[PDB]
Amino acid sequence: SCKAFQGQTLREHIEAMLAAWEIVKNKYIPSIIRVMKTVGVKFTEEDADKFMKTLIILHDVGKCSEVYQKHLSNNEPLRGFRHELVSAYYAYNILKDMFKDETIAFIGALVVMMHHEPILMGQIRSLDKEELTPEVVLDKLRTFNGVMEGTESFIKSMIKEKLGVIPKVPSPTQEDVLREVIRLSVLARHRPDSGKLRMVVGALLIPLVCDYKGAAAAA
Amino acid sequence: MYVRISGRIRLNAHSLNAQGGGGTNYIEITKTKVTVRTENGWTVVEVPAITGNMLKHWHFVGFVDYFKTTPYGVNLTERALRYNGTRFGQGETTATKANGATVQLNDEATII
Amino acid sequence: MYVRISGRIRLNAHSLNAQGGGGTNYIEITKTKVTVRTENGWTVVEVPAITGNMLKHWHFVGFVDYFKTTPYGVNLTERALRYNGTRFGQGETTATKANGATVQLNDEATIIKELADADVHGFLAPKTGRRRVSLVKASFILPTEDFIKEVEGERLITAIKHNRVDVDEKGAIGSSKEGTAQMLFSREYATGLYGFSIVLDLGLVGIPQGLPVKFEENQPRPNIVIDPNERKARIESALKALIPMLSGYIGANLARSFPVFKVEELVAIASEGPIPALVHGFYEDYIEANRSIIKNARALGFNIEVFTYNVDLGEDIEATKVSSVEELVANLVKMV
Amino acid sequence: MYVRISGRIRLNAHSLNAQGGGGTNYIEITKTKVTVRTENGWTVVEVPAITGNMLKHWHFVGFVDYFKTTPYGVNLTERALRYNGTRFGQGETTATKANGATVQLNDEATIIKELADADVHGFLAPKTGRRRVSLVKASFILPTEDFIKEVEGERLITAIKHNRVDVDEKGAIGSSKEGTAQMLFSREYATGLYGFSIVLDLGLVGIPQGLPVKFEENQPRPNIVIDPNERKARIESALKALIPMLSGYIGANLARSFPVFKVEELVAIASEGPIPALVHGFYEDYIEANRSIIKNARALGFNIEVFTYNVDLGEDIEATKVSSVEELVANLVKM
Amino acid sequence: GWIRNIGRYLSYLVDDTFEEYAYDVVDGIAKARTQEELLEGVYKALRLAPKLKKKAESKGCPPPRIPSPEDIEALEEKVEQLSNPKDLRKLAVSLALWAFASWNNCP
Amino acid sequence: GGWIRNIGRYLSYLVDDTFEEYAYDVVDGIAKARTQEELLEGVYKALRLAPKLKKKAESKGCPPPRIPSPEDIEALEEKVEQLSNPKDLRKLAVSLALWAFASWNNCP
Amino acid sequence: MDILLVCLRFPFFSVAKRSYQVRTSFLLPPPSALKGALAKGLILLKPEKYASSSLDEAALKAIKEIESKLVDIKAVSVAPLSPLIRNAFLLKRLRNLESGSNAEKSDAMRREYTFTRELLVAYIFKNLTQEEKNLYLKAAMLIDVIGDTESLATPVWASFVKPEDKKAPLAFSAPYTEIYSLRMYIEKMRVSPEYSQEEIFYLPIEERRYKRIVYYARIYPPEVEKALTVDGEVLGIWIP
Amino acid sequence: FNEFKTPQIDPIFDLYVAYGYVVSLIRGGAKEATLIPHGASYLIQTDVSNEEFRHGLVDALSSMLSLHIALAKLVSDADFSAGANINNVYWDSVPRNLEKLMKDLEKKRSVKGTATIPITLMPSAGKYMLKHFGVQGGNPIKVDLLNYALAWVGFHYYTPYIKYAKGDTTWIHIYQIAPVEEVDMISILSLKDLKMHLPHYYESNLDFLINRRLALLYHLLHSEALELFTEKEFVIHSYTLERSGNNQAIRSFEEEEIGKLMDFLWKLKRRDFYHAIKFIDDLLKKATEGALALIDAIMNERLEGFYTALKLGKKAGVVSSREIVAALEDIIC
DNA sequence: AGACCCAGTTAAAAAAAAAAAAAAA
Ligand code: NI
Ligand code: NI
């Protein structure tokens, strides 16, 4: 029930991402395993597959938020809204709900929030000088007022299409979304192992941006 | 030299110094608040008034009019004959001369 | 001579002390709160006010104007002749005189001996770091509390449009992109029964602050660096500087405003010695407070004289009903 | 002798106790925080509060002027007659006087006898010790809480920008590149119904702090180092110097601002013996609390007289109708 | 509330697309120590409003619309209890601020 | 109490569109009146230009222009007579002038 | 066992730390300041035993007598009930006390102060005699200044209250040496005046704010078995 | 657990050494830790004795020396050396102190001496302190080398500062943030992120900065104003230092103008940041009269001044978006 | 106590150069 583009269904985008992962996993999985072990959590190949599929099914979930849905309907300006941040919050919630690990949900939310890295970089470059000091002073999550219930129910079904675990993500208001996304951004920006976190988030980001150069034109 | 004049003058049927109330057509005369006791304390009442800036302009007009007849009336602003009181407006580093030239600002004595 | 004048004067249609608008055409009059009773608890309201430095600078203007006529006008700064109240500016060590001489500021005695601007109105030289407090203390002229009570409360300010009528050389009006030099603005004019108070502590004229008293032979005498004639002339000029105050010169924008003045009521005291400052002609308990102050001062045996205009004072204090300020300053300068 | 005055005074358009921004064109008057009751949490209001240091300095100024205008006032410091305030420091060990003779600071009785300014306003000589607290003290002058509550949300602060119009020798107002001093400074003024409370401990003038009494034949008697005439003259001078403060000399910028001064109400309590300080006029129900102090004044039977000005302080207790501060000081100097 | 529409219909005087630039009316509304003068200022705004409508319909841009009556009702019922000058100044300055904003006048 | 809405309705009907009779002189007279006499003349003239509005509404099919209630006139007279202060008088006159311009329910 | 309880509606005080270029003050008056004020009152009453060659040693012996009559060094306590706040005052204070540098050397020091409304001050004694109890009761008044002379003090009333041994939360100061198990404040206020030792005091006063500042008030008092009642409310004074 | 004890000196320097402690602990791990504020104690609860505290401290000190070397006797542009320090002597005392710390705390051994305390770390610091009559020949107050280094790292990394010098005069305004009830590592790292506005940002902006207050507002524009994240609200204490003619002193220790300016900025840019940034930048660039008008509307708060600023906005070609005036009205209340 | 001190200092040593993803177009 979610929509990714103005004339493209988000379910088709999800299945295209899944097919791309299924065809590039043999090439891309060992570096992911190594970096995620370097994060500090041990895991198996099936655990890595489950983690990355939960990441993929929520790569652009925030696209079916109310603001971006209205933008898809009619060309109303986004006014600085970004779907990755809501996607980061969703990824953090479902990741932490069934993995019971704080750092795994942390890295997943950070990498999913960096899916649209260069639009964010361009928005920062036009506006002030520093990047993602808290939601560019409330600008990133300003016009966002909520999401349609059915849309989120959709990804719940997507969860059922990945695994039998029930997703217990709460209804996203403004305050909780702000709190979680600020925690994520601040922890990423300032932390003694910032270099290691940047390396691992880039390693997880490479498969996410692998969706360009042909696989994005069709969608 | 120094002369101070005052007095009372009776006026009637004058729209002298009317602001206009902005761009609207209802031209309203200048009004200023004054204090009159009326045996009940110095109450404030809005009364028609005439700005002293207008008196300055009309004194300028009379001065140039009576300086035209003087044999030494050449030493006057170009706008003086124009009946324009604008002296050294926006972006004016020189003085307009009635002879058809310009005056450079170097000293107040030269200007006067 | 220590003198203190105060009183209440009607005033209207004056643009004194414009705030300047902060760069906008609509320049507004300076206003201050007055905290009027309004028949109940103290309620504050902001009404037009006249700054104290306005009064001090116009006293300086009258002072220099009266030195212009008097023979003892050579011992003055040429900056004063420019109607400029600046003492020495900033970053300036040596000052210039009216005759064109240069005076060093290192020693205060040298400044005081051949000057009066730095004596009557004080001075501050940051370069030398030498400061002398003025003998002229000027209060703020505010509409009285009873006036506010009887007018309840308004803005007390009228906005009047003023325009420039500049045209080009041909006699035409266009936009500023071609060279038009006319431009709009507006002015604020105020009114009310204002009240003023001025203190001339003119007992330190010609007296340096570093060594105020000599005590060479162990007896009290002021350290006057000038002859008594010059000091007397300076005192007379300073007192005569009050003549414009009650007639036509208090504020600024005199060319277009020329604030309208009349001596509604006045009271001045002098004793050639330390005296209480008069309560401002602003407060409700004004005349009673003045009567009590004068009767208490005269009950102590002091040789204080008080002169009142358009007020009965206390119908028992020996104070002659004066006629104007000219004879007031005349008697205050011929009393010694 | 021992005097405690307090009350309410309404002041308008005064730049007393400024800061100047530390060297900026904008001059910042003192602004403090006052906590008051508004039945929705103890609210805090930013309102100016005039310090007691200005009151002490103006008492100093009036005192030195009254000695200047008094033939009996000779023992004064020439570097303190310029309203300096500073009297002694560790860098010097000799007191300088307006005459050609100095004071050797080897003892405390000698400095008490030979300098009245060091008596009334105290002094401090770290080189030779022998400190002496200032006899006259003053409190901070801030608007009363009842007035702030009844004026609800208000800051009581206004600023008027003044300027200097200095012009060089040439008849033209130049820029900063020419050397002119045509520049603005924003003087910040204040209004409101301030409260004052000042203590005058004039019972120790000419009385050394170390030995207030002699006690040789075991009878109570003050140790007056000087003759009673000089002590009486000092009392008269101090009570007369209180007059400029209560009349027109409060704060700073007097030559420019001259705060419009008139006492709205005043309560004073005077006695020969020490008396507790009267409650500051800031509080709402302090006048009745003042009566409590009167009860304390009646706790041990003190010969205390109370002067009222635009107040009653009850009816059962004795009071004195005073029409102006000069009448109050006349009553004080009567005894 | 009821500030959006009054600000939108008051900003037309100072708007660039209208070459009359009634700065004086907005100046009078802005710093008004008493209610009567800010009321006079908004009255002058409403009096110039037909001129703005006429020039808008002559140029081609959509004509401005008179403020809704409920806005006037709210303004009248709020202006009466302006016992303290502070709230009156707050309202006048808020109106002046909303008189300076960007609006979609001529597409 | 009550005079506000009815005065607004009538003054709008006098000033609003779909009438081609735009009388602003009466509105200016009501507004700029330091004394009460000229405010009364202005409101009287506004009330007098009732038959024109009624005839035009009947001719062009517009709803009839409602006339202010007599109690509204009562309240007007009481507050004009009981308020000798020019301040409140000016406030009332300018309030009426403000209510002269209102976008009420015009002709469909 | 009696407690000398005094009410003073003083506006301000200034008691700074080892501070220079600024004088930040304590939130509550220190015991040393209270003892000095009481010694000043005693001297003002009658210098029959406080009069001697020098004022310094006279004050020293007065403070010694006060400490002797008090139970211990950290005995006198202070407790506010009104919200007190800390503000800043810039005054030109002379700094001639430095090495040389003439005597008129003055700089604009930020001599900040603490505003308040009303505080209670309790003195602990050792069953002093009736004559001495009256002398101290009349010495409880005459507190005409607290801290520096720029800010004065004014007592309202004085009383002799009893501990009455009732369990209630406390509000007065207490040393932190013995109070460990008890929103909490703690600093050093130099309980021993210096006239030419190591301890830390605790205060049950929090920070709070209004917009961006701190106005100090009291919340969540600890539990102490020793407390009394006065003026309709309940206060608590620690007893060694 | 260890319950790291912290001595009590003053709730400015003590909060600085607490910031040093917490940053050293968060550097290198220290999970399941908290900061308990006790008015002035500011203690830490962490389950470690001493491994990662050393690791984080040495990492932070290495970063300190690297930044000092990169910035430019051994004067540099570093915040802990000359970016906030007002004394020229500090510009040479800091390098030698850091070199001594490097020579001391690198071979797993404790410190052996002490050091002086500066005005920036503690405004109540000075070589002249009176005891009964006068001052001593030295300075009785001393700070341990470890405490000094932790205070330095907390000052440079956590508390923000605004620097503006006009030819001879130099102004530095440091506004430290303190808790009231409780904080956490999320709050600590948020406060670390609050540290911005690198020392040297002056290329041409001074041409319109002129007034100190205007420069302070412009530099606070690029700062951050969000504190509701931490689940606990904070407080700010600001102190200023001036140097006119090489004379350094204190003229402001507890002043509200920084606080009210910060609140006004937070309540203005909450409804947008792009339009607010554009508006403030344009008025600072060309509508200098509007900038002074806005500062006069904040300093000595008067609402009408805002309008005049908006007036100059039309003189500056500002877009004047819909949400800016809504935020201003919300500020008006 | 007392001195100062507070910003530009300028001979052979070592590598060469295109996306299409969606922002207040
Ligand atoms: Ni995406
Ligand atoms: Ni994608």
Swiss-Prot record, chain A:
ssDNase activity requires Mg(2+), ssRNase activity does not require cations. Its cofactor is Mg(2+). One of its GO terms (molecular function) is endonuclease activity. SUPFAM superfamilies: HD-domain/PDEase-like. Pfam families: Cas3_HD. Keywords: Antiviral defense, Endonuclease, Exonuclease, Hydrolase, Magnesium, Metal-binding, Nuclease. It is an enzyme of class 3 (hydrolase). Its EC number is 3.1.-.-. Coiled coil: none annotated. Both ssDNase and ssRNase are inhibited by EDTA. One of its GO terms (biological process) is defense response to virus. Mg(2+) binds at D60, H83, H115, H116. It comes from the Archaea. Optimum pH is 7-8. Belongs to the CRISPR-associated nuclease Cas3-HD family. Monomer. Proteins of this family have an N-terminal nuclease domain and a C-terminal helicase/ATPase domain. In some CRISPR/Cas systems the domains are swapped, in others they are encoded separately. This is CRISPR-associated endonuclease Cas3-HD. It comes from Pyrococcus furiosus (strain ATCC 43587 / DSM 3638 / JCM 8422 / Vc1). The gene is cas3.
